[model samples]
Target: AWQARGLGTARLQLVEFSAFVEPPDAVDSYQRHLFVHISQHCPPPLESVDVRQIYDKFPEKKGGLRELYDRGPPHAFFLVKFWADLNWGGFYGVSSQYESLEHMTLTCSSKVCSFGKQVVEKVETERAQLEDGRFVYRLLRSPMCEYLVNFLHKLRQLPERYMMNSVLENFTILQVVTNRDTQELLLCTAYVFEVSTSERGAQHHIYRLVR
Candidate 1:
């Protein structure tokens, strides 16, 4: 058996499943991503480690999965980590109510970490006129990074099975702006391109961004 929980001091259970069998289709979609991320970032002989070993090392701090099940709406998020070899481990984010798991990358060692309020710090200051007709780009750090994931979901840009929550608490936003009359500002458009590669070459399938 395997289990997951929320990040930091917030005690919330995210998921629990058996590693030997296929989970329900809905659960599998998200769980598969979780497993894949773990496998890729985890060291070799991934499944050989005993499940109890992980728990014995990182014991649950407070609350259990049942409490999370009953708390409805405004799902929570948490950072999750696992260690198989003690020296190596990986970390990722998970949503309490949704089926989402961000990418996981292995770390040389485990450290106490927390995702707190995000702040934006401007690196440079400059001003330009809109009449210049130059493409202007600005980088911003947003605490509301989850909105982008939710926006993508509402627009069907991403699969519904992938739920984004506080896990994406902070991220950078790259904005491309073009000036126009009436002080109208516009956010840059984004597109999702599906691509495939083979021994021959590669193919591209591009789709327009939705609402």
Candidate 2:
């Protein structure tokens, strides 16, 4: 949960703190507050926004996410950002009792940001298992394409081994192990491309498991 909060701080502006802009702990604090507020007020019974209505309200833009609030299974509260930093950015909160107790996934893609073109074709990680044998995990790093590798190298953010060590360096990582007994080696994948409304962008990151 702290890691989730930290990630949120990396993206949103919940408070006015200069340090929160870079450090994970600082960001996590703000995230904690934000989570508490949302959990208390936005508890359950959320309404889903119509796709058509989304289009009408937030018309196609250069780098904008198609936000949607959906109250559905797997995710009791679904907040999807079709175009976040590059084109999409958002979070999904699920109850362990309901979601797959086997897998947890996270992804980062390049759609239409200033550094979009430099993004790898795909980025993802394996599912992490929890201590209590419950479903609670986080995505730490991902494999990137040659193109993205080159870009990261230029930015001094290259990967170490088959992992993205620097992607979320300061963030805590939860382990979601694969059921080696029956699960495949590949944990997740993300493709790169653009949608109908946005060009000069790409998408990647798709995960699956033996739920």
Candidate 3:
């Protein structure tokens, strides 16, 4: 039949917190970025190679994905994702007419990743420039946060199914993309993967930024 924590459990608590940014100012700076993604999840303890096998996926596979760095990565972004396995396919640093940029998707402002707490507190914050040209951060409860908020809400309900004292210890991540070339590859996932040739329309830039 079905099982719970004995097998891989997708029941996870999401923690998206405000990353304290450090600055020396590359001086002529308008913006900076760091790219990152999840590769490891160390439970409060390990079975040595049990959770460890899943722990080493992205950091190992990312070597094949590092080809784009030859052109010098554009943004100063460190992307910390919520998943262990992600696909970064079909991008080439082989000099296509790609233009790279850092597009801000969403940011959270809570210190909520204590897996034992199981609290779904989150605040979506963003920057806005004043008419006088100064920028300020404010709480942005727009429509975009709906799904992520819902996801955290789901995570908050996990203890209802498993009544135990479990905690997530550590998660390691790595960034493999630099610059803003609108690369066809990325870090989004929900799979049943299929690939086919685009015979008729070899035109138009198609983006498949998977995470």
Candidate 4:
């Protein structure tokens, strides 16, 4: 069993949307808050720990697996995810080289619907723009992150799930990579999903942009 929540005080809600990217000119922007939080809390004060070693050891401990599951799901279910995509200043903050990324995978679970016999499937995928201006696709490596597993589990149990047609959901851990030169590491969960197409979707999910 696992759970996850957004950065804000509330869990995932349509009326209370959480975002990863904030416009540059906006004050108190979600993006700004995320950067601030990362700057303040991204790296622990303790001596620099080998992220690689940490990744290596993550699978050995049962508590660690529970931690990851409790934190977020290993895969990204289409309607069940807690990630925000900031613009990253046109790639200034994101990495351009795929080789620098490591430890990636995507996983999901199954659900059966009783009413219509329609099954809501969970799916996940990852994409990266290449130097040639095209995109490349591949299965994520192995050894996922705790944040994503928590993110998925959290997403599956939100109030919105009741209104939506998610019979079941799952998440897949896509990739885990670190840049030693920049001291930056990222763990990504990629997932795919199926939803009701005919039903009029509810207009929920909230956020603000301060000028």
Alpha-carbon lDDT of model 3: 0.23
Model 4 ranges with Cα > 4 A deviation: 1-130, 133-166, 169-185, 190-194, 197-211
Q: Residue 43 in model 2: shift from native, Å? A: 5.5
* TM-scores for all predictions: 0.16, 0.27, 0.22, 0.20
Model 4 per-residue lDDT tens digits across residues 1-211:
1322321111111111121223465554333322101111121111122223223222323323234334443321112222322112211121112211223222221222223131233334344434344333333222223343344345445565333334323322222222223323232222223322223321222121011
Question: By lDDT, who's the top model here?
Answer: 4
Better of 2 and 3 by lDDT: 2
Model 3: residues >4 Å from true position, as ranges?
Answer: 1-75, 79-139, 144-146, 160-211
State the displacement of the C-alpha of residue 71, model 1, in Å, after optimal TM-score superposition. 47
lDDT over C-alpha atoms for residue 38 of model 4? 14
Better of 2 and 4 by lDDT: 4
TM-score of 1: 0.16
Local accuracy of candidate 2 as per-residue lDDT tens digits, 1-211: 2222211111121111110011245446534111111111121122333333323222134312222112111221122221111212122221111113454443222231232222212323334455565443433222223543343334333233223323322111111122344432211111122221224332222121111
Cα lDDT, all candidates: 0.21, 0.24, 0.23, 0.26
Whichever of 1 and 4 has more lDDT, that candidate is 4
Report the C-alpha lDDT of model 3 over 74-166, residue by residue, as the tens digit: 122122323211111111110101111333222332222232221333333233324333222233212323433343334335443222112
Q: Which of the two candidates, 3 or 4, achieves a greater lDDT against the reference? A: 4
TM-score of 4: 0.20
Backbone clash count, each prediction separately: 1, 23, 23, 36
